[PDB]
From a paper:
Herein, we report the identification and characterization of epoxykynin, a potent inhibitor of the soluble epoxide hydrolase (sEH). Epoxykynin inhibited the hydrolase activity of purified sEH very potently with an IC50 value of 6.7 ± 3.2 nM. Additional analysis of inhibition of the phosphatase domain of sEH by means of an AttoPhos-based assay showed that the sEH-H and sEH-P inhibitor ebselen, but not the sEH-H inhibitors AR928150 and epoxykynin impeded the activity of sEH-P in this assay. These findings demonstrate that epoxykynin selectively inhibits the C-terminal hydrolase domain of sEH, but not the N-terminal phosphatase domain. The crystal structure revealed that epoxykynin binds to the catalytic center of sEH-H, occupying the binding site of the endogenous epoxide substrates. The ligand is stabilized by hydrogen bonds between the amide oxygen of epoxykynin and residues Tyr383 and Tyr466 and an additional hydrogen bond between the amide nitrogen of epoxykynin and Asp335 of the catalytic triad. The N-alkyl amide binds to the catalytic triad of sEH-H, while the lipophilic cycloheptane occupies a deep hydrophobic pocket. The constraint indole ring creates distance to the small, electron-withdrawing bromo and trifluoroacetyl substituents.
While the biological role of sEH-P still remains elusive, sEH-H was identified as part of the CYP epoxygenase branch of the arachidonic acid (AA) cascade. It catalyzes the hydrolysis of epoxy fatty acids, such as epoxyeicosatrienoic acids (EETs), to their corresponding vicinal diols. Thus, sEH-H plays a vital role in the catabolism of bioavailable epoxides, contributing to the detoxification of xenobiotics and regulation of signaling molecules. sEH-H is involved in a variety of disease-associated pathways, e.g., hypertension, diabetes, inflammation, and cancer progression. The active site of sEH-H consists of the catalytic triad Asp335-Asp496-His524 as well as the two stabilizing residues Tyr381 and Tyr465 opposite of the catalytic triad serving as an oxyanion hole.
Numbering used by the authors: 228 to 547
Write the structure that this text describes.
Amino acid sequence: LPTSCNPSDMSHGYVTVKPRVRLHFVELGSGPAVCLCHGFPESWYSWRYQIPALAQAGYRVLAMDMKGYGESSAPPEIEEYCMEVLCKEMVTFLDKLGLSQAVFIGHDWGGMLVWYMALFYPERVRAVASLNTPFIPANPNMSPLESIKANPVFDYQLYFQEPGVAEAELEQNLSRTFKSLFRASDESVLSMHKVCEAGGLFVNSPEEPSLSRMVTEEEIQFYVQQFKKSGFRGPLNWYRNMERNWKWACKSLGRKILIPALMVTAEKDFVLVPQMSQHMEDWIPHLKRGHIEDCGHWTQMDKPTEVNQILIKWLDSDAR
Ligand SMILES: O=C(Cn1cc(C(=O)C(F)(F)F)c2cc(Br)ccc21)NC1CCCCCC1
Ligand SMILES: [Br-]
């Protein structure tokens, strides 16, 4: 396993992007700035195997707690978590750090964010990489509701819409929640396509799940402690701006991403399947790619060595 991170041995940074919205990050290394943006329901700590490796390779790594998470602010309002607001806040973050540009690397919702940053703020994005999450141009002729209903494996997203419902289930037993979620593909105890019918994520899953081979008890407990701070409302709110996000995205239609760009697919992510990325070169002509076999949704901790090799190869070449 690559070198990991001990939270108390990190530098912890805090930037107020607006009154009452303060973003926390950890920072390691010197060199060009690289900003890592996690997914749902994660942490800066999801990048624990990439932070040392990137620092060692000659980068200044800034691993965020995204808004809603960890030591970052978690306001309750849904519209605080639309992409337009989130991206503008990441630009403010760079401004207050005095960074003209950073490389942005995201996974999952953080992947979506970094695509949006590359599209709307290219002057601030030196290069962009996404793990698992593709870049799909908004289709102005289709409602987000339609699109989500048109894919069985997105059913959990409908469950996530009604405020309070998923929060209560996810918060009920945090250790159960993270042990249930953070599993390899072959260890999965959940089906994303059968959730609204069933009445929740964990209705058919073990009350006392085993520990995945991917994680230790201590690592699970870190996530538990982080999610006692603000719970899952802010995180889930990332999913509750589908119309607002689509309207914003439509404003960028026709624009091509011309900065250096990397798309990394994961063979065994059964929601963000590799084939979802198949047309991206239409919009990102000089896209580069990596592909990780035997890798599920939780890319960074499933295949940390492979992620590190892909990112470093790309950083040291196409991205410069
Ligand atoms: O919804 C997710 C994250 N996500 C949650 C999963 C769960 O098990 C949980 F219970 F937590 F909800 C989950 C499971 C797999 Br497999 C993959 C991804 C998962 N990401 C979206 C994907 C769609 C469009 C792009 C933006 C990001
Ligand atoms: Br999966």
